[PDB]
Amino acid sequence: MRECISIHVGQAGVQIGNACWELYCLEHGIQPDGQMPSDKTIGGGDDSFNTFFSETGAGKHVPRAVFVDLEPTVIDEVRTGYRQLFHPEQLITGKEDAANNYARGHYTIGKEIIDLVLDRIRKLADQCTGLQGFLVFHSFGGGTGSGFTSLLMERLSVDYGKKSKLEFSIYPAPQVSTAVVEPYNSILTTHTTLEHSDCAFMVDNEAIYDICRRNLRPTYTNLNRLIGQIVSSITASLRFDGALNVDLTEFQTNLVPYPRIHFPLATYAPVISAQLSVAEITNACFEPANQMVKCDPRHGKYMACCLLYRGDVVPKDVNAAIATIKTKRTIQFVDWCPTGFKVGINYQPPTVVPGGDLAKVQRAVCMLSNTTAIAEAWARLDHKFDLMYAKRAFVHWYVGEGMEEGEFSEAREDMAALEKDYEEVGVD
């Protein structure tokens, strides 16, 4: 009765989406060719995976996925190494990359391809009768994943204004960065997609790299597998039995109070090399060094918490873990009915990749918590933006695609307003 259309923009979006759909086929027991051993006896939908997976006339469980990128290498990689799983009609390729430029993907190169992607989006939405919205997979640093994401968000806000759109962004990291103007692209795509995004799970690769270094350099494959595990356990509640956060409106209402403050934080305890009590893994979800954003939540104030447990976790000791967490004076909630840890428990254990990077575990916990500690990350990004705009460095690569000079000052004013609003939330 409900459908979701996943959208992947950029090389990072395409690779993350392929890993995530592989893990979704692994967790739900769907065969890689598209058939299902057990659940295909009915042959119909609404079997708790109809929010993501669509069934054709031949019984194939093709995912409702759109892979868009301006480079066809990763698209052909998905089409070769999967091919019968993803239809070639919904996989849109491009000719020329935007090449780490926001304005190239937003004004010239993405504008020649935005209409075909919109037509494919409408064609995939015609099969959906009760669709909720879209999951945008992109990355902040790239040229496609910022410019085409911003133009896509503008088009989906004009044309699909009654729907709510998520966001799955990749925050740039100095450990693995292929460009220098990632602050410029990130600030511009934050200012453009501020009013068009309702939940942005921005995760930086520095935290994933540090987790892979200290628990598991690790390459992009290990980072992709860990990020796919993180996103799969984030969206485990949407593809399973209903406890909480099973809808996009639930995500938008349990964590996002403001029209602009829609940046949650995820934290994951059970990262072990390929036992552990509930209290310590609940305590490890509050550790600042295990978060998916490199920031300190103890200097900020929480706004919400949606603890999602996976595996055979008894719900009796979860409340005792909650009490032992709340006895500590580290967490300082807001002072207008802050509620608490809205725990929902799914009894299906999470499945890991056979011989991959994460071992199979019985107790898994994720902490979808909003805070004001993301303002430190935005202050870092605006400090890098202000350092490269005092002397107008790298400016001409954007003005040559039709972008004006005042767009950078507008994005700086928008980021100053975002920092001021985060401070005003943080000040009673």
Partner: protein, 425 residues
């Protein structure tokens, strides 16, 4: 006898109405088939206000259960009083509002208000004479408060010469986890000020306090709150359900208890409150006016009783009740206004509620109810100064000046309450 059409909006209204109807049908001696089986002729007297007389001695209630989710209707039908209710009077929507007042006041309440107006007009055109409408709903929910205020506006437009009695349940943070409830409460309070003549301010905060201190139950389960509000509603409506000296048939209750068109917020209470025991007159009277016993989060020592209608149920001596209440009124003459003489009306009904030998129900327009409208308004101030969840309501066509208008009207009500409290004879 006159005829009242009962209206319940929301799942809180549906649950409390089902428990209330069960308590009434136990008290009036009506079985699940709608046939009379009581032992007193007073139970069959004044039964046409609530129970419609169908064919073959079937006394079905004239209840209009309104909701936006069919699960509440299935829970009503699955209970014991489900076959007792009228199956043609069930109205249920497809999608609930879910703590959204704008969605239940502008879109979904508007899209179902034509059907509920058709049902109301079908019930009203068969009336020989209409007495009024009794409304039971919660001010915090999504379709409850919004559709209740829209139904109130439509009823006031259609029948301007009829009374509007509302059992408005004010939300509280101690039993409700939703944060946006001051918005719904303040908006419904602003609608009920301008378009309603009666309000029974039953507060869940005081219910939780009663269940915590008096009943010594830590958990505020909704069944115990349902039982307590149903007992208090039965004790309030024993004036309408049985003939006596104080009939108080809706309009008479409004003439006695309401001095001003804005200051019509009552404060019901129930003295012998016991969960699922010697009873006598002076203990019941000293439990009647206690701050802990009352079902609204108020302090009667800080306010003045404008009107009091204390009703006793059971087999008691009327002279001792009158002497005890006169002693209470004379001993606490600073707690009553001196510019309204003889403001305490006493009535005695011989039929007690089932499970209790004696009962003592008090209704009062005390000035201490402005503490509740200061508490809800100050929780509204901490939720409007930072615009939390304001994009939901303002995206449904609601202006942001509507919240300012509601806050200004509630502040004006608080100012007028304090001004009339400061005046003395």
């Amino acid at each position: 006898m006159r005829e009242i059409v009962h209206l319940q909006i929301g799942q809180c209204g549906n649950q409390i109405g089902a428990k209330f109807w069960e308590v009434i049908s136990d008290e009036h001696g009506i079985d699940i088939a709608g046939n009379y089986c009581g032992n007193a002729s007073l139970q069959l007297e004044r039964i046409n206000v609530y129970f419609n007389e169908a064919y073959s001695h079937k006394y079905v209630p004239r209840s209009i259960l309104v909701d936006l989710e069919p699960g509440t209707m299935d829970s009503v039908r699955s209970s014991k009083i489900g076959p007792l209710f009228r199956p043609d009077n069930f109205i249920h929507g497809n999608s609930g509002a879910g703590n959204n007042w704008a969605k239940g006041h502008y879109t979904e309440g508007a899209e179902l208000i034509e059907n509920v107006m058709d049902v109301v007009r079908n019930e009203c055109e068969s009336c020989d004479c209409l007495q009024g409408f009794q409304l039971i709903h919660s001010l915090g929910g999504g379709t409850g408060s919004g559709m209740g205020t829209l139904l109130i506006n439509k009823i006031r437009e259609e029948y301007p010469d009829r009374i509007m009695n509302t059992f408005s349940v004010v939300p509280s943070p101690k039993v409700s986890d939703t944060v946006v409830e001051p918005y719904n409460a303040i908006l419904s309070i602003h609608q009920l000020i301008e378009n309603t003549d009666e309000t029974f301010c039953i507060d869940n905060e005081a219910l939780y306090d009663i269940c915590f201190r008096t009943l010594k139950l830590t958990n505020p389960t909704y069944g115990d709150l349902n039982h307590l509000v149903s007992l208090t509603m039965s004790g309030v409506t024993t004036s309408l359900r049985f003939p006596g000296q104080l009939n108080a048939d809706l309009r008479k209750l409004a003439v006695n208890m309401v001095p001003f068109p804005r200051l019509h917020f009552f404060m019901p209470g129930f003295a012998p409150l016991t969960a699922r025991r010697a009873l006598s007159v002076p203990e019941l009277t000293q439990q009647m006016f206690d701050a802990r016993n009352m079902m609204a989060a108020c302090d009667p020592r800080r306010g003045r009783y404008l009107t009091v209608a204390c009703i006793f149920r059971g087999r008691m001596s009327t002279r001792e009740v009158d002497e005890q209440l006169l002693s209470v009124q004379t001993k606490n003459s600073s707690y009553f206004v001196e510019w309204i003489p003889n403001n305490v009306k006493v009535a005695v009904c011989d039929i007690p509620p089932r499970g209790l030998k004696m009962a003592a129900t008090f209704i009062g327009n005390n000035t201490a109810i402005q503490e509740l409208f200061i508490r809800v308004s100050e929780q509204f101030s901490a939720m409007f100064r930072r615009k939390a969840f304001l994009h939901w309501y303002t995206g449904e066509g609601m202006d942001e000046m509507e919240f300012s208008e509601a806050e200004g009207n509630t502040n004006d009500l608080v100012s007028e309450y304090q001004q009339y409290q400061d005046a003395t004879a």
